Design an enzyme around this catalytic site. Structure first.
Site, PDB file in Angstrom:
ATOM      1  N   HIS A  46      18.948 -23.559 -23.965  1.00  0.00           N
ATOM      2  CA  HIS A  46      18.874 -24.992 -23.659  1.00  0.00           C
ATOM      3  C   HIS A  46      17.478 -25.476 -23.278  1.00  0.00           C
ATOM      4  O   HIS A  46      16.702 -24.719 -22.692  1.00  0.00           O
ATOM      5  CB  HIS A  46      19.795 -25.312 -22.484  1.00  0.00           C
ATOM      6  CG  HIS A  46      21.152 -24.693 -22.590  1.00  0.00           C
ATOM      7  ND1 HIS A  46      21.619 -23.769 -21.686  1.00  0.00           N
ATOM      8  CD2 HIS A  46      22.147 -24.874 -23.489  1.00  0.00           C
ATOM      9  CE1 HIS A  46      22.837 -23.396 -22.030  1.00  0.00           C
ATOM     10  NE2 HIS A  46      23.183 -24.055 -23.120  1.00  0.00           N
ATOM     11  N   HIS A  48      15.734 -27.623 -20.653  1.00  0.00           N
ATOM     12  CA  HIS A  48      16.015 -28.205 -19.355  1.00  0.00           C
ATOM     13  C   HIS A  48      15.001 -29.298 -19.061  1.00  0.00           C
ATOM     14  O   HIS A  48      13.921 -29.363 -19.675  1.00  0.00           O
ATOM     15  CB  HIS A  48      15.986 -27.149 -18.259  1.00  0.00           C
ATOM     16  CG  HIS A  48      17.140 -26.198 -18.302  1.00  0.00           C
ATOM     17  ND1 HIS A  48      18.004 -26.028 -17.240  1.00  0.00           N
ATOM     18  CD2 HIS A  48      17.567 -25.358 -19.272  1.00  0.00           C
ATOM     19  CE1 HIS A  48      18.916 -25.125 -17.557  1.00  0.00           C
ATOM     20  NE2 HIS A  48      18.671 -24.703 -18.784  1.00  0.00           N
ATOM     21  N   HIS A  63      20.090 -29.380 -17.685  1.00  0.00           N
ATOM     22  CA  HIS A  63      19.818 -29.613 -19.100  1.00  0.00           C
ATOM     23  C   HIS A  63      19.217 -31.002 -19.276  1.00  0.00           C
ATOM     24  O   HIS A  63      19.638 -31.954 -18.625  1.00  0.00           O
ATOM     25  CB  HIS A  63      21.092 -29.448 -19.947  1.00  0.00           C
ATOM     26  CG  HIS A  63      21.708 -28.088 -19.836  1.00  0.00           C
ATOM     27  ND1 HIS A  63      22.924 -27.767 -20.401  1.00  0.00           N
ATOM     28  CD2 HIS A  63      21.277 -26.963 -19.215  1.00  0.00           C
ATOM     29  CE1 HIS A  63      23.213 -26.505 -20.141  1.00  0.00           C
ATOM     30  NE2 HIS A  63      22.232 -25.994 -19.418  1.00  0.00           N
ATOM     31  N   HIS A  71      27.968 -32.002 -21.103  1.00  0.00           N
ATOM     32  CA  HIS A  71      27.507 -30.836 -21.845  1.00  0.00           C
ATOM     33  C   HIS A  71      28.377 -30.597 -23.091  1.00  0.00           C
ATOM     34  O   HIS A  71      29.598 -30.697 -23.021  1.00  0.00           O
ATOM     35  CB  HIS A  71      27.484 -29.598 -20.943  1.00  0.00           C
ATOM     36  CG  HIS A  71      27.060 -28.345 -21.646  1.00  0.00           C
ATOM     37  ND1 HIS A  71      25.745 -28.072 -21.952  1.00  0.00           N
ATOM     38  CD2 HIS A  71      27.781 -27.299 -22.120  1.00  0.00           C
ATOM     39  CE1 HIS A  71      25.667 -26.911 -22.573  1.00  0.00           C
ATOM     40  NE2 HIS A  71      26.889 -26.422 -22.697  1.00  0.00           N
ATOM     41  N   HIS A  80      24.323 -32.966 -24.168  1.00  0.00           N
ATOM     42  CA  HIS A  80      22.994 -33.231 -23.630  1.00  0.00           C
ATOM     43  C   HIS A  80      21.971 -33.104 -24.757  1.00  0.00           C
ATOM     44  O   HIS A  80      22.142 -32.267 -25.643  1.00  0.00           O
ATOM     45  CB  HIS A  80      22.665 -32.218 -22.522  1.00  0.00           C
ATOM     46  CG  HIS A  80      23.637 -32.218 -21.379  1.00  0.00           C
ATOM     47  ND1 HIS A  80      24.070 -31.059 -20.769  1.00  0.00           N
ATOM     48  CD2 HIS A  80      24.260 -33.235 -20.731  1.00  0.00           C
ATOM     49  CE1 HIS A  80      24.906 -31.359 -19.789  1.00  0.00           C
ATOM     50  NE2 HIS A  80      25.030 -32.675 -19.738  1.00  0.00           N
ATOM     51  N   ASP A  83      21.062 -29.497 -25.414  1.00  0.00           N
ATOM     52  CA  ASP A  83      22.106 -28.532 -25.766  1.00  0.00           C
ATOM     53  C   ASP A  83      21.891 -27.926 -27.155  1.00  0.00           C
ATOM     54  O   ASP A  83      22.361 -28.462 -28.169  1.00  0.00           O
ATOM     55  CB  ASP A  83      23.504 -29.154 -25.665  1.00  0.00           C
ATOM     56  CG  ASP A  83      23.889 -29.503 -24.238  1.00  0.00           C
ATOM     57  OD1 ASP A  83      23.250 -28.972 -23.310  1.00  0.00           O
ATOM     58  OD2 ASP A  83      24.818 -30.316 -24.037  1.00  0.00           O
ATOM     59  N   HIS A 120      19.823 -18.046 -21.369  1.00  0.00           N
ATOM     60  CA  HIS A 120      20.737 -17.766 -20.246  1.00  0.00           C
ATOM     61  C   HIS A 120      21.405 -16.407 -20.296  1.00  0.00           C
ATOM     62  O   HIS A 120      21.420 -15.733 -21.329  1.00  0.00           O
ATOM     63  CB  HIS A 120      21.804 -18.858 -20.094  1.00  0.00           C
ATOM     64  CG  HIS A 120      21.268 -20.142 -19.550  1.00  0.00           C
ATOM     65  ND1 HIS A 120      21.437 -20.522 -18.232  1.00  0.00           N
ATOM     66  CD2 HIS A 120      20.512 -21.108 -20.125  1.00  0.00           C
ATOM     67  CE1 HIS A 120      20.826 -21.674 -18.026  1.00  0.00           C
ATOM     68  NE2 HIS A 120      20.251 -22.048 -19.154  1.00  0.00           N
ATOM     69  N   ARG A 143      19.507 -17.965 -15.442  1.00  0.00           N
ATOM     70  CA  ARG A 143      18.374 -18.179 -16.329  1.00  0.00           C
ATOM     71  C   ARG A 143      17.567 -16.882 -16.418  1.00  0.00           C
ATOM     72  O   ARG A 143      16.945 -16.450 -15.429  1.00  0.00           O
ATOM     73  CB  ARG A 143      17.525 -19.318 -15.771  1.00  0.00           C
ATOM     74  CG  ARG A 143      18.390 -20.520 -15.430  1.00  0.00           C
ATOM     75  CD  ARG A 143      17.644 -21.660 -14.784  1.00  0.00           C
ATOM     76  NE  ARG A 143      18.584 -22.719 -14.435  1.00  0.00           N
ATOM     77  CZ  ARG A 143      18.261 -23.975 -14.159  1.00  0.00           C
ATOM     78  NH1 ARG A 143      16.985 -24.373 -14.164  1.00  0.00           N
ATOM     79  NH2 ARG A 143      19.228 -24.839 -13.870  1.00  0.00           N
TER      80      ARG A 143
END
Ligand code: CU
Ligand code: CU
Ligand code: ZN
Ligand code: ZN
Lengths: 153, 153
Positions: A46, A48, A63, A71, A80, A83, A120, A143
């Site tokens: 993602h 962020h 995000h 999401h 998002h 995403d 992630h 993360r």
């Protein structure tokens, strides 16, 4: 910008370089590169909100969500901007990323330059997990590595 | 962007955090924070063109110079947009950075978001050193540490 790049680093072994290429500003962004040190299988991937790594990946925020949506996966209308779904690592712990997305951009309101790419701990459930967490982070967990997305040539 | 941040790292001991703030899109940018690990004295301080750290600081390219001018000091009219002059490291190898600049911006074309902040080995001669190199890099020598400038909260 037609090109951007991101060096992913973290506390553990995960590291890689991700390229972004946008041939024209009304167009898809190609996202590709290798991430090493990933456990075999799916990993949330993602953009962020903040390009702030002062507290490591934690300071990157949530995000990137300029439209204030829930999401989702990259193919959903409800998602998002950041995403990008999952990337898959092989049995040698390598993810050869190859994604094309038309929602993120390298300019304008959805511009991702100066923000943080994060890979992630676990699979992104793409907003389908049936809990509040699913609608926020996809339940992708920790993360593992991140970097600020910068302008490239 | 009204705020940005940069974490500087290199191959050696040099490390720091630099904040940027711009209250109005057509106002000056405040630049502040601290860098440690620097030999006592003056050190060149510039925004370089690319936010590409795949080769560390080396891949950031030359000073950010969208108007194709000669290298200068921050208060010269003839300067690179990325020319922020010298920071001063004290006897304990710490530079406290406090700058205000009207040429860089956190939005528009002179936008430094997603470019690389670099602190150099030597003093920047502000382009007055009377040789070719001076008009390019200010003779500030090697890139001791750098980071990609990211959007901050
Ligand atoms: Cu994420
Ligand atoms: Cu420089
Ligand atoms: Zn999301
Ligand atoms: Zn310069």
């Amino acid at each position: 910008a037609t090109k951007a790049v991101c060096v992913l680093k973290g506390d553990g072994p995960v590291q890689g370089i991700i390229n972004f290429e946008q041939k024209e500003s009304n167009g898809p962004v190609k996202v590709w590169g290798s991430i090493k040190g990933l456990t075999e299988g799916l990993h949330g991937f993602h953009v962020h909100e903040f390009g702030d790594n002062t507290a490591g990946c934690t300071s990157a925020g949530p995000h990137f969500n300029p439209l204030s949506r829930k999401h989702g996966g990259p193919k959903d209308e409800e998602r998002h901007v950041g995403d990008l779904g999952n990337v898959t690592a092989d049995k040698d712990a390598v993810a050869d990323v190859s994604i094309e997305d038309s929602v993120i951009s390298l300019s304008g309101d959805h511009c991702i330059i100066g923000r943080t790419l994060v890979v992630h701990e676990k699979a992104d459930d793409l907003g389908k997990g049936g809990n509040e967490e699913s609608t926020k982070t996809g339940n992708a967990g920790s993360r593992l590595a991140c970097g600020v997305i910068g302008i490239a040539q």
